[PDB]
Amino acid sequence: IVGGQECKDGECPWQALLINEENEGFCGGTILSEFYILTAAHCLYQAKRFKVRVGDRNTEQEEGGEAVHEVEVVIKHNRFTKETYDFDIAVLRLKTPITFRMNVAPACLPERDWAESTLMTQKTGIVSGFGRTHEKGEQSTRLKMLEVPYVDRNSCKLSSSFIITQNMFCAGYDTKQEDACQGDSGGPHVTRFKDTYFVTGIVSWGEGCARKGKYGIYTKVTAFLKWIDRSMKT
């Protein structure tokens, strides 16, 4: 996360962290339930073997609440391809159930039609992760969050070197130096409605981080609510 600030205790409880066999984070995820993590399909291409850490807020200190989970099944969208980054979604079933606690709790899945009309029309959403704090720099040892405005699809298309599909939406800032960055992908984009946070996106890609005239691109979760449903039930 470039800009923004550190998540306070309990503030970003749906954050998950995919960790490689070096025990280093390389992607985020969203807790959907005691057994399921939502992440980006492109994240599955990095570590051949990875685990999931929940409850972590500082990767340099072991603090109460941290737990590690092995992944039992990876459900990657059949249509994802790096040619387009379209359908950049996967679900992970964990071998053992997450115990919800301080800093560990799922984000709500909205109902599709209501999400489209009510959440996707909100001014902002919140993105979080442990990724780089500057485009060329180091990953953050602390969990960060960032409020990101929804960006008009056409303004986004005009700004983008690549095709923005119906399974994507754009969020962030034209020139202000705040955005998600390398290491944050796979992680949550959630939208608060009244008193509840609903998962609306998956951090997916960007041309750099926080570049002038470029936005953050997210998988549009509303497009995949039935898919997520089926994936969690199989």
């Binding site: 205790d9 919800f100 301080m102 709790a105 209501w114 509840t196």
Partner: protein, 43 residues
Amino acid sequence: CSDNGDCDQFCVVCSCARGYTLADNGKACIPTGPYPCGKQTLE
């Protein structure tokens, strides 16, 4: 549904995500456990 039908969550007929029940009033949503989805956690 265009003040959200006065609903706390989904929308006139209100409803709520998994781990919640619609309150008697029929607009608010009540968590059934200590860690309902989409709520920041309290110590």
